[PDB]
Amino acid sequence: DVPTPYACYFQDSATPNQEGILELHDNIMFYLLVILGLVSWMLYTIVMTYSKNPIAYKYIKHGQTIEVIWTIFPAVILLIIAFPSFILLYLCDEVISPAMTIKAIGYQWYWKYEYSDFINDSGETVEFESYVIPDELLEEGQLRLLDTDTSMVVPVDTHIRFVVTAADVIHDFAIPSLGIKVDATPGRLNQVSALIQREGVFYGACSELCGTGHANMPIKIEAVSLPKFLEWLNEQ
Amino acid sequence: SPLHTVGFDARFPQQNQTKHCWQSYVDYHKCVNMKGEDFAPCKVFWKTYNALCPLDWIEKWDDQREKGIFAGDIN
Amino acid sequence: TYFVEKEHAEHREHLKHVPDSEWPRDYEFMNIRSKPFFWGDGDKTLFWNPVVNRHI
Amino acid sequence: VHFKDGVYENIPFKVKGRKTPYALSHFGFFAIGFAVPFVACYVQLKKSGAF
Amino acid sequence: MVQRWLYSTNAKDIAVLYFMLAIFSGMAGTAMSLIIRLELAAPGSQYLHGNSQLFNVLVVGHAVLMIFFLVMPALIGGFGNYLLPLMIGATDTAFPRINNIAFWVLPMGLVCLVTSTLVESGAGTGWTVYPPLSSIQAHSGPSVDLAIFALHLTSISSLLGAINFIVTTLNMRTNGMTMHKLPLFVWSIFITAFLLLLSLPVLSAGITMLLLDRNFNTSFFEVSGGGDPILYEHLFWFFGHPEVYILIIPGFGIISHVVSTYSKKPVFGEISMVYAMASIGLLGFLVWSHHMYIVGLDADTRAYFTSATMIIAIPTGIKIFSWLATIHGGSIRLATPMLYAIAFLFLFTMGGLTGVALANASLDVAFHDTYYVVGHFHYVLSMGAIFSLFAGYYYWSPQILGLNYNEKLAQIQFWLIFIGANVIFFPMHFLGINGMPRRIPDYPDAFAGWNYVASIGSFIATLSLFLFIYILYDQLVNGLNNKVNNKSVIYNKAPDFVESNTIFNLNTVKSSSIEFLLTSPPAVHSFNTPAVQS
Amino acid sequence: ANKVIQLQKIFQSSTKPLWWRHPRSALYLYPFYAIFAVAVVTPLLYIPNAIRGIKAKKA
Amino acid sequence: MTHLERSRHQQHPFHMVMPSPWPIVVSFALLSLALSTALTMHGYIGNMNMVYLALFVLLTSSILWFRDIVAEATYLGDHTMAVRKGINLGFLMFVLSEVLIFAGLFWAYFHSAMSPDVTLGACWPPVGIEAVQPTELPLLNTIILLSSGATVTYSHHALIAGNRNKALSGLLITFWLIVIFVTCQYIEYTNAAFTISDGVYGSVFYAGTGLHFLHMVMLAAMLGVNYWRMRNYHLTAGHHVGYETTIIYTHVLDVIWLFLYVVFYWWGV
Ligand code: HEA
Ligand code: HEA
Ligand SMILES: CCCCCCCCCCCCCCCC(=O)OC[C@H](COP(=O)(O)OCCN)OC(=O)CCCCCCCCCCCCCCC
Ligand SMILES: CCCCCCCCCCCCCCCC(=O)OC[C@H](COP(=O)(O)OCCN)OC(=O)CCCCCCCCCCCCCCC
Ligand SMILES: CCCCCCCCCCCCCCCC(=O)OC[C@H](COP(=O)(O)OCCN)OC(=O)CCCCCCCCCCCCCCC
Numbered sequence A: 001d002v003p004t005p006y007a008c009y010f011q012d013s014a015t016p017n018q019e020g021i022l023e024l025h026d027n028i029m030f031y032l033l034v035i036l037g038l039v040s041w042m043l044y045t046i047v048m049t050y051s052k053n054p055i056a057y058k059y060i061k062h063g064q065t066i067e068v069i070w071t072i073f074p075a076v077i078l079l080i081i082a083f084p085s086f087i088l089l090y091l092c093d094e095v096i097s098p099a100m101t102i103k104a105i106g107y108q109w110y111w112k113y114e115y116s117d118f119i120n121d122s123g124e125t126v127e128f129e130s131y132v133i134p135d136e137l138l139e140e141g142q143l144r145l146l147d148t149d150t151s152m153v154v155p156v157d158t159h160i161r162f163v164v165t166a167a168d169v170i171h172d173f174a175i176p177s178l179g180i181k182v183d184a185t186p187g188r189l190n191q192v193s194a195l196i197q198r199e200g201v202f203y204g205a206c207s208e209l210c211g212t213g214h215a216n217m218p219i220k221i222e223a224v225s226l227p228k229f230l231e232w233l234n235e236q
Numbered sequence B: 001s002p003l004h005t006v007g008f009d010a011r012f013p014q015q016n017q018t019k020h021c022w023q024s025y026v027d028y029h030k031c032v033n034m035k036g037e038d039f040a041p042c043k044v045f046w047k048t049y050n051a052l053c054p055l056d057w058i059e060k061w062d063d064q065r066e067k068g069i070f071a072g073d074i075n
Numbered sequence C: 001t002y003f004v005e006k007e008h009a010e011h012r013e014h015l016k017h018v019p020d021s022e023w024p025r026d027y028e029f030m031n032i033r034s035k036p037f038f039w040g041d042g043d044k045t046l047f048w049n050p051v052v053n054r055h056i
Numbered sequence D: 001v002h003f004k005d006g007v008y009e010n011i012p013f014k015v016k017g018r019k020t021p022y023a024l025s026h027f028g029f030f031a032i033g034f035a036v037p038f039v040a041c042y043v044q045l046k047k048s049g050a051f
Numbered sequence E: 001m002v003q004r005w006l007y008s009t010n011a012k013d014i015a016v017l018y019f020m021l022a023i024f025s026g027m028a029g030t031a032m033s034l035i036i037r038l039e040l041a042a043p044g045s046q047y048l049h050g051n052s053q054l055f056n057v058l059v060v061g062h063a064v065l066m067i068f069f070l071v072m073p074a075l076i077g078g079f080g081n082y083l084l085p086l087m088i089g090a091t092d093t094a095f096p097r098i099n100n101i102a103f104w105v106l107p108m109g110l111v112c113l114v115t116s117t118l119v120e121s122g123a124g125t126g127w128t129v130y131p132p133l134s135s136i137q138a139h140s141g142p143s144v145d146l147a148i149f150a151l152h153l154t155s156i157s158s159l160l161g162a163i164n165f166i167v168t169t170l171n172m173r174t175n176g177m178t179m180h181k182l183p184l185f186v187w188s189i190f191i192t193a194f195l196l197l198l199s200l201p202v203l204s205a206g207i208t209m210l211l212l213d214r215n216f217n218t219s220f221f222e223v224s225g226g227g228d229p230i231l232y233e234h235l236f237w238f239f240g241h242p243e244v245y246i247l248i249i250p251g252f253g254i255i256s257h258v259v260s261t262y263s264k265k266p267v268f269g270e271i272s273m274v275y276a277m278a279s280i281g282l283l284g285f286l287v288w289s290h291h292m293y294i295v296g297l298d299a300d301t302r303a304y305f306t307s308a309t310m311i312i313a314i315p316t317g318i319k320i321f322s323w324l325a326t327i328h329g330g331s332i333r334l335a336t337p338m339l340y341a342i343a344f345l346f347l348f349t350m351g352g353l354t355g356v357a358l359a360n361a362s363l364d365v366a367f368h369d370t371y372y373v374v375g376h377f378h379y380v381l382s383m384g385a386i387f388s389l390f391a392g393y394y395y396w397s398p399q400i401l402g403l404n405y406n407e408k409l410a411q412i413q414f415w416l417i418f419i420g421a422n423v424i425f426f427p428m429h430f431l432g433i434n435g436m437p438r439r440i441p442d443y444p445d446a447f448a449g450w451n452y453v454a455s456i457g458s459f460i461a462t463l464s465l466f467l468f469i470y471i472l473y474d475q476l477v478n479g480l481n482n483k484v485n486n487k488s489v490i491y492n493k494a495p496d497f498v499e500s501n502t503i504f505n506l507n508t509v510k511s512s513s514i515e516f517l518l519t520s521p522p523a524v525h526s527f528n529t530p531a532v533q534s
Numbered sequence F: 001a002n003k004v005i006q007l008q009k010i011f012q013s014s015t016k017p018l019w020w021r022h023p024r025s026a027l028y029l030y031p032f033y034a035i036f037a038v039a040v041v042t043p044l045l046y047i048p049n050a051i052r053g054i055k056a057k058k059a
Numbered sequence G: 001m002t003h004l005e006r007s008r009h010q011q012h013p014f015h016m017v018m019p020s021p022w023p024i025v026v027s028f029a030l031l032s033l034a035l036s037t038a039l040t041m042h043g044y045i046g047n048m049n050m051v052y053l054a055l056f057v058l059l060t061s062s063i064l065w066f067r068d069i070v071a072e073a074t075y076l077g078d079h080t081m082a083v084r085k086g087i088n089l090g091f092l093m094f095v096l097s098e099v100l101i102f103a104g105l106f107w108a109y110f111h112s113a114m115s116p117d118v119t120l121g122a123c124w125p126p127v128g129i130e131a132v133q134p135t136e137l138p139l140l141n142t143i144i145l146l147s148s149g150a151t152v153t154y155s156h157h158a159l160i161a162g163n164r165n166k167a168l169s170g171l172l173i174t175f176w177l178i179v180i181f182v183t184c185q186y187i188e189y190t191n192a193a194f195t196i197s198d199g200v201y202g203s204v205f206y207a208g209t210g211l212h213f214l215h216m217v218m219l220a221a222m223l224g225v226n227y228w229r230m231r232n233y234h235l236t237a238g239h240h241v242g243y244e245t246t247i248i249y250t251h252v253l254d255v256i257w258l259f260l261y262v263v264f265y266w267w268g269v
């Protein structure tokens, strides 16, 4: 949900898509460690023994058995991890039966949120802009370059469709703990899906160099319960 | 739950969703140009282009239709 | 080619009499001026022809 | 064209038989390379009004 | 003197100018990476007074200098122009006046890029220069024009040199040498010359079209006229990936010579090494959109590019196992060039294994603009291509110059860069996996830990570069004395076990390429009667 | 007319550089060098204004 | 010829070019061109007089470089069989690179047309754009180009056979046929109803056919150089390399224009 000092791993997951991304990272690193164990060992035990060999084996120049075998072995490993990597690719691309859609538009160094399902009691479009709190205006305990003056409120256990675009230059809607990353290009609309399994606050940032204010454009998302979301929605 | 939004459409199954907005806006305005502004199932288009399409885009297309510059073929 | 080109010359002669009031209005993508051209008046291209090309 | 052969003959700079020490040429040449990013910073910080 | 170095038509003299310009440029690009790492040491404004445009300007200048003004004029302009004609028996290059213009456009391209950072505000765009951030609305004034003209002048240089490399190899080989008998370093410059010939013209279309949007009222990429920013990325990345291989393959051929010399064994499976270098150069044209995994392409487009990217790991792994097979059962001699080659085999494998994770489109969602990517490409470019550039200089400069270098000073230099490079780039993977974006001058406070560690290693590695500058001075002033005292290595191959000391003096050199049989500084007229082989 | 053989013997017995051997080469090389100097110096005399942000007053 | 006489001649066939000033003078004209164009496009220089001078100096400095290649092959005898074979191979690699420049312009055209953008009307061509019709002045051009690849074939084979008048007439006709093509595109441009400013259509159209226009002006300059050299007895019946490079050029440009006419004129309209 938030980065921590000296951390060397994924932030904790809140969606099934980020659960699956982490599962594929760990599955691949199982086989990259076998390969690094071999190569570093052969390298070490060749220098330590043949730096003291006075007669070189100059008549060994080829081998048919080992050269065929070491051409086939990397193909089997590469095929083993492509099976779950293809399944995850098509499981995240599907957006089937969502219950709400939210639009997010990137601007020169702020974000903008629009709700247009007209579920609120008066049937308008709910929309506001989100800005980073400046350093001079921070209250003690708030997080630098992360906390914003307004946030996006969503309910839990609900399938949500996100629609992302931009106004001036390219930006990027990204929240590490939700498994979301998608460019925001002036001219087209991309979509992504999410389903949050616990409550809390999840932080993100812009991820497409957008000029001087590329570091001052964070994303903050609050997930609450359903009766709590309807009360917030019906007021703001 | 009281939450509803437009669902999966087989004409636009990819991540790119640009034409889904534009076609619903175009269908809606030509539905009221011949079948009248009021039509029970002519609201199906109106909900979809409102749900998934920026308010600044609709603002631009409305102004173009006023000057006869909308590039969509609605008449 | 002479026959087909000879016809287009009269069509150019009729447009040269059309005043700028009923010239069709530009679309959003027509006559893009992100910044003026750095030659002449800043509004005309290399092979600009006033009879057929206009900016209004 | 015919050129000379030897040790210090296939380079464009003089190392021996010169009045000034070769250290002034060798390290002066690599000092100017290391110093162009700082000249750029100076001009741009003097444009923003930081200086 | 004036007409030997301004009117030159000799390929050895021109190769010396290349190396002089290449090393003067790595000074500037290292100074920019040091300013960058000082501003990233801690949260808050540190040294640049909050000028975020200036921080972005120095990042573009850092990448352009390292790639187009250091690694290409040294590995290709330098070693290719000097050792390729000598390794095949050629008396010159084909087209000697073309060979000279391809150098003199690089000084003019430097007085275009430097004056780009001093005018208005510079180009704070990234080395990829995406629009619309790089168009006249979001970047006004002449800075992005002057950076495009600089890139145009480096493309004229590399294209003209590639045409010259291709004709010379095919037309000017010596008596008895057929294409199956070429040294492996000659093969690596020949294949690289073909990738440049088929990828540079697509980049010149992309960035000339970007110049037209800015100044001539054109809509290739402008969204208000119908254009598309995603077209530029297809055109830029169709040159980009082939470029990274244009930067590693010449180093593949250097590593082959060094490893074979200091093992006293021929390269294992020499014919399958050429087939692998050709397969990697061909598969590098079919994988470019792994750099666009999150811009909204179709799911069936992304599944193709996943499998295409993965299968370049098979030919590359053949070259890794082949190199370990030649040193097995050898007689290893641990001179300075051999130290870099053994570190290359260990540090290139690590950088290439983090690329296999990035090759899957599903996992790249957590690896976009993440420091994790920055960690991948500094392991294969700075502990890869750079380590092969040091291995080359220590291998051939005593012959080329006639002057020896202080050996024990050079082993101190190697250990200081091996220690310091690892300290900068290993924690970059920790920052990325936890979610730190790239191209930012400032960050949240939880990222302070590893960012302090990396800034320390940046001082260790710059000190190692300053020791290399002194080693050059010592070789040029004391090179003749380094041969009579015991401060340098005289023979890269020692006598065999049963070979006596005086029999060894009959044939001091046991070489499978011509270059070690010439005079120490090779003669300006190197061949009159052509060399002959069976 | 044909002048290949006559120019063939002028060129092959001359000490001057290649671009100077033809008797007519003075008329090209003298004015080119003067023009080449103006075309290189003048753009350089404008970088001081470009850094200082002064624009020409063609108005 | 004994051993004494063989010693006075080279032992290899390759060409040792003497030092020349041109390669470093062309580089300075390239920087003067780059610095001037960027400075005038943004107002730091009042007019286009300095850009004109830099183009004139890039031009007359390449002429002098070409002038020194004529003397090394006609008056000095430095182009042996091996030098001749290398020159031909370098030129084929030059045109392959230039062909892929058009390949990048055909990518941009197809990217914009197969799924056209909605601000155009989601239609190709965009609404309101009146395009060039194929069966018109562009059909006279595709015949004028095909007609010059057969008058250049009989000029080349009349020079191998030793017929001078027939050779000199089949080249004076190829010249004026490429000249006619060039002014026919000029008429087609000043009469078109759209401009390069008219969105993404006027950008990909005038880029693909406008680059080809510039090569043709270079192609007509090459046939005029061959005309002077063939009329003044430089070219011989077995040694004419400046001619074969021109011939290969007129045939690649013929194929490229054929592709432009099928995609930009028949399919895209
Ligand atoms: C040739 C490639 C190359 C090399 C060598 C380096 C070297 C280094 N790079 Fe960089 N780097 C890039 C290519 C390279 N880099 C690219 C393409 C980018 C991305 C740009 C973008 O984001 O837009 C980048 C970005 C980048 C960033 C990202 C900044 C941000 O995102 O805004 C950082 C941050 O610290 C960084 C650091 C370093 C450091 C500390 C070194 C140092 O460790 C160097 C260590 C070793 C040396 C000191 C060099 C050797 C010295 C020589 C002169 C060699 C001489 C040898 C002989 C002649 C024999 N690099
Ligand atoms: C020398 C330069 C160089 C080299 C050689 C490489 C090599 C590879 N690269 Fe890299 N790359 C860059 C330079 C380089 N790259 C740069 C500069 C960027 C960032 C550009 C920018 O944004 O500015 C980049 C970014 C980049 C991306 C884009 C990611 C992103 O931006 O989000 C990807 C995507 O897949 C990638 C993957 C690979 C792969 C699979 C290889 C493969 O070739 C690696 C293969 C090697 C091995 C695999 C090691 C040895 C193999 C074996 C021992 C076999 C046994 C193994 C198994 C069975 C697994 N790298
Ligand atoms: C070349 C590139 C290599 C890629 C490596 C990228 C990282 C991959 C993920 C590695 C997970 C590390 C475990 C986290 C332990 C932890 O929990 O960390 C704990 C602390 C701080 O933790 P804390 O106090 O914040 O909280 C949690 C408190 N328990 O840190 C450390 O002890 C740092 C120690 C570094 C770990 C060594 C890494 C060895 C991995 C080798 C990978 C080899 C590459 C394979 C071939 C490419
Ligand atoms: C400033 C001094 C002026 C002194 C005043 C004169 C009084 C008399 C003193 C006598 C000195 C005469 C001064 C003349 C200038 C001079 O000799 O050294 C001055 C030269 C400059 O000139 P430059 O020709 O190199 O051009 C360059 C001008 N921009 O520095 C240098 O390049 C130092 C460069 C050394 C670093 C290069 C190291 C590379 C080694 C070669 C290895 C190649 C490997 C190849 C592998 C492919
Ligand atoms: C910005 C606008 C774009 C301008 C383009 C850049 C201009 C730079 C070059 C200026 C032209 C001067 C003439 C030099 C060429 C020459 O003379 O070729 C003639 C060379 C001379 O061979 P030799 O003398 O070396 O050997 C001595 C033997 N007698 O024959 C060859 O090599 C044979 C192969 C011909 C290939 C020539 C390629 C054309 C060069 C331009 C390539 C530009 C590519 C990028 C395209 C945008």
Ligand SMILES: CCCCCCCCCCCCCCCC(=O)OC[C@H](COP(=O)(O)OCCN)OC(=O)CCCCCCCCCCCCCCC
Residues within 6 Å of the ligand: C045, C046, C047, C048, C049, C053, E152, E204, E205, E206, E208, E209, E216, G101, G189, G190, G191, G192, G193, G194, G195, G196, G197, G206, G207, G208, G210, G211, G214
């Ligand atoms: C380095 C490698 C080069 C890569 C090049 C890739 C892209 C090149 C494609 C563009 C080439 C020039 C197009 C022809 C001009 C044109 O466009 O035709 C002319 C158009 C059509 O006239 P009109 O609009 O008035 O309409 C007519 C209505 N009556 O007018 C204009 O444009 C005016 C603007 C001038 C355009 C000049 C641009 C020059 C910059 C590029 C220089 C050429 C590149 C190098 C070639 C050797």
Ligand SMILES: CCCCCCCCCCCCCCCC(=O)OC[C@H](COP(=O)(O)OCCN)OC(=O)CCCCCCCCCCCCCCC
Residues within 6 Å of the ligand: G055, G058, G059, G062, G066, G069, G070, G073, G074, G079, G087, G218, G221, G222, G225, G234, G235, G236, G239, G240, G241, G242, G243, G245
């Ligand atoms: C604005 C400035 C632009 C400047 C560009 C001008 C281009 C106009 C073309 C003029 C070409 C004249 C060449 C004649 C030289 C000659 O004499 O060639 C003839 C020589 C002599 O052989 P022989 O058979 O006559 O022997 C006589 C009997 N023994 O053979 C050759 O060298 C063959 C090589 C010719 C290749 C010329 C270069 C072509 C590519 C250049 C492209 C440059 C622009 C690229 C832009 C993208």
Ligand code: CUA
Residues within 6 Å of the ligand: A106, A109, A170, A171, A172, A206, A207, A208, A209, A210, A211, A213, A214, A215, A217
């Ligand atoms: Cu928006 Cu970076």
Ligand SMILES: [Ca+2]
Residues within 6 Å of the ligand: E039, E040, E041, E042, E043, E044, E045, E046, E441, E442, E443
């Ligand atoms: Ca900081």
Ligand SMILES: [Cu+2]
Residues within 6 Å of the ligand: E240, E241, E244, E288, E290, E291
């Ligand atoms: Cu890549």
Ligand SMILES: [Mg+2]
Residues within 6 Å of the ligand: A207, A208, E369
């Ligand atoms: Mg990105």
